Amino acid sequence: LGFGGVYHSLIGPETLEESYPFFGYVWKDKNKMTNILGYHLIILGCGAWLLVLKALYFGGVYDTWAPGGGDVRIISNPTTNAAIIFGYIVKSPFGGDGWI
Amino acid sequence: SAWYGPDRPLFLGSLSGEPPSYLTGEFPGDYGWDTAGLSADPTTFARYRTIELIHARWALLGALGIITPELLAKNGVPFSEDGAIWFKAGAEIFKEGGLNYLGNENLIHAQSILATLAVQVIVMGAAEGFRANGEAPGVEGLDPLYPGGPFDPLGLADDPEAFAELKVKEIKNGRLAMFSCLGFFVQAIVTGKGPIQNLQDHLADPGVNNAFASATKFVPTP
Amino acid sequence: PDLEKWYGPDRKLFLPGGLLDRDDVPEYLNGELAGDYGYDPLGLGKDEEQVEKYRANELLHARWAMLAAAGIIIPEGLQANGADIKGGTWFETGAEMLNGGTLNYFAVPFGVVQNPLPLAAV
Amino acid sequence: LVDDRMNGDGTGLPFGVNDGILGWVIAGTLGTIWAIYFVSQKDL
Amino acid sequence: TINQFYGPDRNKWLGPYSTNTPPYLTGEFPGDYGWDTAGLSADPETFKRYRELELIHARWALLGALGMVTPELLQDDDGIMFGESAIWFKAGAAIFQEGGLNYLGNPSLIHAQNIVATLAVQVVLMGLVEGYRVNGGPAGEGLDPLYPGEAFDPLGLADDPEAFAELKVKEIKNGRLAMFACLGFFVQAIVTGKGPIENLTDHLANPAENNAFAYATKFTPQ
Amino acid sequence: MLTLKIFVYTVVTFFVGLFIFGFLSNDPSRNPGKG
Amino acid sequence: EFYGPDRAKFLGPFSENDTPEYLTGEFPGDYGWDTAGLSADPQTFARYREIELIHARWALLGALGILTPELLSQYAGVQFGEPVWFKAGAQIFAAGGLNYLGNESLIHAQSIIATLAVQVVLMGLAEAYRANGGSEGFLDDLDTLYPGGAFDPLGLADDPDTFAELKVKEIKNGRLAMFSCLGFFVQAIVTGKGPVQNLTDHLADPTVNNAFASATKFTPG
Ligand code: CHL
Ligand code: CHL
Ligand code: CLA
Ligand code: CLA
Ligand code: CLA
Ligand SMILES: CC1=C[C@H](O)CC(C)(C)[C@H]1/C=C/C(C)=C/C=C/C(C)=C/C=C/C=C(C)/C=C/C=C(C)/C=C/C1=C(C)C[C@H](O)CC1(C)C
Ligand SMILES: CC1=C[C@H](O)CC(C)(C)[C@H]1/C=C/C(C)=C/C=C/C(C)=C/C=C/C=C(C)/C=C/C=C(C)/C=C/C1=C(C)C[C@H](O)CC1(C)C
Ligand SMILES: CC1=C[C@H](O)CC(C)(C)[C@H]1/C=C/C(C)=C/C=C/C(C)=C/C=C/C=C(C)/C=C/C=C(C)/C=C/C1=C(C)C[C@H](O)CC1(C)C
Numbered sequence: 001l002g003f004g005g006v007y008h009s010l011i012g013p014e015t016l017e018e019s020y021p022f023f024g025y026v027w028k029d030k031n032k033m034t035n036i037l038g039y040h041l042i043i044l045g046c047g048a049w050l051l052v053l054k055a056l057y058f059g060g061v062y063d064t065w066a067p068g069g070g071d072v073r074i075i076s077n078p079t080t081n082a083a084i085i086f087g088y089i090v091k092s093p094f095g096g097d098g099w100i
Numbered sequence: 101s102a103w104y105g106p107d108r109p110l111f112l113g114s115l116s117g118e119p120p121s122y123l124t125g126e127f128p129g130d131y132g133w134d135t136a137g138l139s140a141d142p143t144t145f146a147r148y149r150t151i152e153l154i155h156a157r158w159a160l161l162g163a164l165g166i167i168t169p170e171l172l173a174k175n176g177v178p179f180s181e182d183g184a185i186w187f188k189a190g191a192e193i194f195k196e197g198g199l200n201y202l203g204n205e206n207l208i209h210a211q212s213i214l215a216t217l218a219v220q221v222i223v224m225g226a227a228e229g230f231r232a233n234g235e236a237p238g239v240e241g242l243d244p245l246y247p248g249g250p251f252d253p254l255g256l257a258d259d260p261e262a263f264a265e266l267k268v269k270e271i272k273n274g275r276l277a278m279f280s281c282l283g284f285f286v287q288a289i290v291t292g293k294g295p296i297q298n299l300q301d302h303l304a305d306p307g308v309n310n311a312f313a314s315a316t317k318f319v320p321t322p
Numbered sequence: 323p324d325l326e327k328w329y330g331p332d333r334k335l336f337l338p339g340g341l342l343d344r345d346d347v348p349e350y351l352n353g354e355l356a357g358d359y360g361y362d363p364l365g366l367g368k369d370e371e372q373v374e375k376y377r378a379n380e381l382l383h384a385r386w387a388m389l390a391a392a393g394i395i396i397p398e399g400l401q402a403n404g405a406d407i408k409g410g411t412w413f414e415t416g417a418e419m420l421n422g423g424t425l426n427y428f429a430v431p432f433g434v435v436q437n438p439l440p441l442a443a444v
Numbered sequence: 445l446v447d448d449r450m451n452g453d454g455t456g457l458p459f460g461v462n463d464g465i466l467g468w469v470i471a472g473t474l475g476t477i478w479a480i481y482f483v484s485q486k487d488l
Numbered sequence: 489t490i491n492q493f494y495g496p497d498r499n500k501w502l503g504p505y506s507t508n509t510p511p512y513l514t515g516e517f518p519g520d521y522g523w524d525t526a527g528l529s530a531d532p533e534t535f536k537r538y539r540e541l542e543l544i545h546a547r548w549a550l551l552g553a554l555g556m557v558t559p560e561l562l563q564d565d566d567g568i569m570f571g572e573s574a575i576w577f578k579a580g581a582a583i584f585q586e587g588g589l590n591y592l593g594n595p596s597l598i599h600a601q602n603i604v605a606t607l608a609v610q611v612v613l614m615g616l617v618e619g620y621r622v623n624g625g626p627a628g629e630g631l632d633p634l635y636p637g638e639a640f641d642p643l644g645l646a647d648d649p650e651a652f653a654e655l656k657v658k659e660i661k662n663g664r665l666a667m668f669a670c671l672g673f674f675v676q677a678i679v680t681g682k683g684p685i686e687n688l689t690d691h692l693a694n695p696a697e698n699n700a701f702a703y704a705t706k707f708t709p710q
Numbered sequence: 711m712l713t714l715k716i717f718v719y720t721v722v723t724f725f726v727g728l729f730i731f732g733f734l735s736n737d738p739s740r741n742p743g744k745g
Numbered sequence: 746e747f748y749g750p751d752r753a754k755f756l757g758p759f760s761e762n763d764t765p766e767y768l769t770g771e772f773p774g775d776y777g778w779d780t781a782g783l784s785a786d787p788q789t790f791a792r793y794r795e796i797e798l799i800h801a802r803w804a805l806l807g808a809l810g811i812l813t814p815e816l817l818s819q820y821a822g823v824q825f826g827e828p829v830w831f832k833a834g835a836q837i838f839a840a841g842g843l844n845y846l847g848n849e850s851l852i853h854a855q856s857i858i859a860t861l862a863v864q865v866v867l868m869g870l871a872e873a874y875r876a877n878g879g880s881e882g883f884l885d886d887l888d889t890l891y892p893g894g895a896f897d898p899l900g901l902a903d904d905p906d907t908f909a910e911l912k913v914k915e916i917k918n919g920r921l922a923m924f925s926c927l928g929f930f931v932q933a934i935v936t937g938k939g940p941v942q943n944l945t946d947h948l949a950d951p952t953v954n955n956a957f958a959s960a961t962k963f964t965p966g
Contacts, residue, residue, distance in 0.1 A: 007340070011340060012340060013340065019339070081303070081304065081305065081306075082306075083303060083304075086458070087456055087458045088456075090458045090459055091456055091457065091458055091459070091460075092457075092459075092460055096453055096454040097454055097455075097456050097457075112619055112622065112623075113619075114623075115616075115619030115620070115622065115623045116619075116622070116623065117622050117623040117624070120533075122533075135537065135541065136534070136537050136538065136541065137533055137534040137537040137538075138534075140531045140533060140534050141531070141782070141785040141786075143765070143766075143767075143782055143785055144782035144783070144785050146782070147779075147780060147781055147782030148781075148782065151781065175464045175465075175468070176464065176465070187964065187965070188964060190960065191960075191961050191964070194957075213957050214952075214955070214957070229756055229758075229759030230759075232756060232759050232760065232762075232763055233758075233759055233761070233762040233763060234762055234763060235762055241762075244763065288965060289965060292965040292966050310604070312603055315580055315581075316581060316584075319577070319578070319681075320577075320677060320678060320680070320681030321681050322680060322681040322682045400596050403595055403596040403599070404594055404595040404596045405594060405596035405597075428596070430597065431591050431592055431597060432592070448711075450711065450712060450715075462712075463712065465716065466712075466715065466716055466719055469716060469719070469720050469723075470719060470720070470723045473720050473723040473724050473727060474723055474727050477724065477727035477728065477731060478727070478731065481731040481734075485735070502873055502876065505873040505876070505877050505880070506876070506877075507876070507878060507880065508876060508877070508878060508889065510788070511788075512788075524792070525792060525796070525876075526789075526792065526793065526796065527786075527788055527789035527791070527792030527793050528789065530786040530788045531786065699858075701838075701857060704834060704835065705835055705838075708831075708832070708835070708937075709933060709936075709937035710937060
């Protein structure tokens with residue numbers, strides 16, 4: 001990564017849209033900003049689903065609440081329901097519940 | 101968004117191909133969805149257009165009348181369990197309490213479905229007959245599909261382009277409401293529960309509480 | 323459509339423009355054959371006529387390996403999933419028919435056919 | 445019990461809603477301001 | 489010859505007893521026997537649309553009618569291959585058992601357990617190909633919407649005009665045969681709830697008391 | 711006693727709605743500059 | 746009256762203003778109620794008007810044939826195998842057979858397959874002759890919708906003014922019989938009783954026994 005960074009800072013193209021329309025942007029090309037957001041959000045969804053793959057299919061991650069003092073537990077039947085997930089995100093941030 | 105003219109949106113997007121020659125885009129709700137061509141003759145086109153619009157209005161009315169009572173029933177209004185779910189509401193008139201609007205004893209309280217339907221026939225026959233003429237006592241002769249006037253006290257039909265886009269809004273909302281109403285008749289036939297209760301049970305576990313859970317109910321037996 | 327991305331003087335290379343100059347490609351690759359990426363570091367390309375000679379070997383080789391890849395991935399998957407293929411794994415398939423052994427064809431969707439053909443005649 | 449209390453403190457109430465009338469009036473106020481803003485949008 | 493079915497004296501829906509032939513049905517297109525007693529094909533472009541959806545209906549009914557009995561044909565004596573799901577009108581429940589959706593009794597074939605996912609893939613893919621059918625794409629765009637024949641006809645066959653005429657009326661008759669047979673399939677599913685081949689065996693055992701008259705009491709409103 | 715809660719929740723959503731649609735409502739053009 | 750622009754219509758005064766331009770009251774039973782617009786062409790006018798007339802006659806015979814056995818069983822003291830109109834199909838499956846006036850001398854049929862075969866062949870010949878409008882000179886003429894000769898031995902096909910008046914009478918009776926037979930059909934489903942018994946039970950208590958007393962018979966649960 002550092003080699004690529006120093007390369008694009010020094011000998012990399014000084015301006016991007018004259019050779020790579022896919023990589024060049026003026027800061028009013030709102031459609032291509034939304035495209036960049038789409039790419040990054042797809043990456044973040046991939047990372048979250050990677051944690052899904054670890055929790056359900058790779059047999060990892062420690063649960064502190066297993067009997068006897070916790071255990072590394074492969075999570076079966078995770079609770080994905082919108083009621084609990086959204087009630088977890090829209091509640092008060094104080095000691096009564098805690099928001100997040 | 102250019103809802104008229106040749107550049108109108110179509111019923112399949114870019115894959116729609118050529119819209120029919122007899123539908124060039126003068127009327128609201130235009131997308132070229134004319135696979136069977138029921139509307140070849142312009143008079144037949146006009147009759148179907150009026151039928152579509154009247155059904156759009158009736159579907160919008162039915163949509164609120166089918167969502168609101170069960171929402172109030174689950175939100176503290178003391179409806180009976182019989183009349184909270186819409187397809188059984190007509191059975192509430194057969195009870196000793198009569199038809200209690202919003203669960204109130206001294207509200208409506210009707211027990212004679214015969215006289216209720218009789219006054220219903222008289223009132224709605226008069227209304228639809230006045231609709232059919234285009235002339236009513238106190239109402240002059242004008243467009244029968246779009247009266248306005250006494251039916252538009254707010255005065256939102258005065259300006260042309262906003263009136264046209266509001267026509268588009270009306271026909272598209274009517275089409276959405278008639279999807280909803282046909283869906284409600286489908287859950288009424290299949291599920292036997294209210295549509296809001298169906299969505300409520302669908303939110304508990306969307307994996308199994310969907311349309312696939314009722315695929316084996318109507319299967320015949322030898 | 324869009325032949326300029328693969329054909330022509332300016333094409334995709336095995337290295338981008340910032341690391342590979344457009345003059346470092348040798349002369350006999352000027353963008354007229356399929357897969358022209360300018361990747362000839364050693365002395366095997368020599369000239370365009372020898373390139374055309376090795377093109378037949380390369381294309382038949384690619385097609386043969388493509389058949390090999392498909393016929394490797396499919397029968398072993400069928401064996402691991404439950405199909406009666408009797409030797410789906412690719413590098414033991416010859417060891418089945420030596421003494422009196424046979425093979426079975428799973429031709430979808432109506433496979434499971436017992437082959438009585440001997441190895442010598444095959 | 446010696447007094448009538450709301451008894452909603454905690455329990456994971458979304459937005460602190462314990463009765464439906466409060467959520468309905470929240471949605472009603474926001475929808476009222478939204479309708480005013482939408483009908484009076486585009487300045488004129 | 490060709491004139492036996494495309495002449496003005498062609499085969500009709502009554503043979504020589506179709507004196508009052510409709511004027512617009514002259515025998516140009518495949519079929520055109522004149523069976524339009526309802527007169528719903530009076531308009532020309534509408535008659536074109538009805539003909540196109542007729543051939544589409546016919547072809548997909550040919551697939552359906554042929555595929556009705558093939559799993560029941562491959563059903564064995566006891567049913568290790570398929571259990572209760574060998575019957576046509578019980579095939580969908582092949583997704584909900586403990587094993588999955590096996591094509592021909594084995595886990596190596598299909599073996600799916602997400603009916604919702606296969607529903608989504610089916611909808612996206614074949615809605616896209618319907619868009620290709622009505623607009624065009626990789627196969628062809630400006631061809632005949634009903635009769636393209638460019639990438640879908642690789643075995644020669646479609647090159648001779650009298651062959652076109654003959655095996656196009658062969659299309660329309662085979663399609664109508666499957667169409668009528670499919671009606672038989674649905675209604676025998678309703679009135680009896682028993683499979684077609686097993687009903688056929690029960691009838692060929694004793695045709696006398698085994699008929700639809702044996703199920704005429706089933707729909708009696710007691 | 712929940713009546714106080716309903717009243718204050720209503721007025722809080724009213725003020726917050728004023729804030730939200732006020733900044734949704736083409737706020738950056740409320741400037742004397744050439745922009 | 747019933748003809749010309751001053752004819753009767755399907756809404757009375759409510760239909761005085763808006764009528765289709767293609768419905769002038771030339772044909773019998775024209776009140777001009779084509780508000781769906783399914784009939785714009787003269788070809789389908791001809792074909793589907795013929796459909797309407799044949800349905801009118803057939804519903805009239807259905808109405809006269811449904812109420813006759815029940816009206817002969819009740820208030821007339823005549824016994825049959827089964828007097829109910831939609832239960833008369835199953836009565837053939839008993840040992841008694843197909844009985845005309847309660848006596849085994851008449852008909853006494855027990856072969857449903859043979860009698861259905863003779864019905865279908867006779868009906869096919871008669872209907873092909875109807876659609877032909879005659880063949881080979883034998884009745885190969887005439888109206889094909891209003892025959893008259895070879896079907897009117899009473900000689901009432903003359904005097905076209907009163908002939909058209911009775912023609913309108915015919916189409917009105919046919920529509921009313923379509924109502925009557927449709928009512929028999931759906932009353933067979935929502936109640937499962939004979940129409941004559943329904944009329945007799947309704948007269949004793951019209952407030953209790955109505956359609957609404959059986960309005961919850963098809964609710965889903
Ligand atoms: C033309 C299409 C089509 C038809 C006719 C059927 C029919 C049937 N599916 Mg089915 N399916 C169809 C498509 C599809 N299904 C499924 C997935 C399933 C599942 C998961 C299950 C079924 C099951 C059933 C049966 C339910 C029992 C019953 O009495 O149902 C109603 C049927 C009748 C009363 C018989 C008369 C049918 C006739 C009216 C249909 C013809 C006109 C229709 C209105 C179709 C119009 C076109 C469009 C809307 C499909 C039934 C015979 C169930 C089963 O097999 O249980 C044992 C089951 O579990 N289907 C998918 C998703 C892949 C489909 C996709 O296209
Ligand atoms: C939920 C669990 C689930 C499981 C465990 C499986 C398991 C399986 N599915 Mg799947 N499926 C599942 C869900 C679903 N499937 C499908 C739809 C399908 C299809 C359509 C097919 C499968 C097939 C398979 C099998 C693939 C393995 C294989 O043959 O590998 C070895 C093979 C490969 C690694 C690749 C082989 C590709 C094949 C197209 C090769 C063709 C070669 C030709 C030269 C093509 C030439 C064509 C033209 C260009 C000339 C396997 C047993 C396949 C099957 O049953 O095969 C018998 C199959 O065809 N599934 C859907 C709908 C989206 C599912 C939804 O949940
Ligand atoms: C959201 C659906 C919708 C929309 C967008 C329109 C739009 C329009 N209608 Mg219309 N209408 C509708 C539903 C709708 N209608 C329904 C359901 C009925 C049956 C009662 C009618 C019956 C009707 C008649 C008889 C006429 C119109 C007319 C018009 C046009 C001018 C009137 C106007 O602009 O007022 C403004 C429209 C709106 C602000 C949108 C409606 C949103 C309201 C506030 C929701 C009401 C729901 C509320 C809970 C009350 C329940 C309904 C109750 C009154 C029964 C216009 C384009 C007139 C016309 O044809 O033009 C010449 C006219 O003659 N409509
Ligand atoms: C939905 C299927 C369907 C459709 C769209 C058509 C459409 C058409 N047919 Mg066709 N037909 C069909 C099924 C169908 N047919 C079947 C199954 C048969 C075998 C019995 C025939 C036999 C047939 C003949 C012999 C002829 C036609 C002809 C025609 C064309 C003009 C007639 C017409 O417009 O009638 C209108 C059709 C419709 C409005 C749609 C039909 C759907 C109806 C309304 C619902 C079901 C009807 C009925 C209840 C079925 C149950 C009874 C069953 C036992 C038969 C037209 C394009 C004529 C032609 O010129 O050939 C090109 C011709 O002479 N058809
Ligand atoms: C199957 C029976 C049948 C048939 C073939 C016809 C045919 C015809 N009628 Mg008619 N009609 C009928 C029943 C029938 N009618 C009944 C029962 C009534 C009393 C409600 C009427 C009352 C009536 C009036 C007042 C007029 C006609 C007229 C006409 C002619 C105009 C063309 C047309 O209507 O467009 C096409 C029609 C259709 C495509 C109908 C399709 C049928 C579907 C399945 C709808 C079913 C509705 C449902 C059963 C309603 C419940 C019944 C309820 C009313 C009790 C036409 C030849 C006009 C005329 O000038 O007479 C010559 C006219 O003025 N009819
Ligand atoms: C266009 C086209 C063209 C192509 O080419 C072809 C085709 C396909 C033919 C097409 C299509 C068509 C269609 C889809 C149609 C549909 C429509 C609808 C859905 C309607 C509804 C519509 C709907 C509607 C009205 C509805 C209504 C409703 C109602 C009244 C309700 C009422 C009620 C209520 C309130 C409640 C209570 O408790 C009960 C009651 C009293 C009962
Ligand atoms: C005329 C006028 C004029 C003057 O001047 C003014 C005024 C007054 C304004 C006027 C009036 C108007 C009106 C009447 C209006 C109305 C409207 C409406 C009703 C709408 C709705 C509208 C409505 C609608 C769309 C509806 C929709 C619905 C829906 C989607 C549903 C869905 C669903 C379903 C399916 C099922 C499930 O289980 C559930 C859910 C999921 C939920
Ligand atoms: C022409 C005319 C003229 C005169 O005048 C009048 C009138 C009467 C109108 C007429 C006639 C008409 C008609 C006949 C109609 C018919 C129709 C039909 C046949 C339908 C069905 C139709 C039907 C159909 C398509 C069907 C189809 C089927 C299918 C797809 C199936 C599928 C499948 C399979 C494979 C197997 C699996 O396990 C299941 C499923 C997946 C499901």
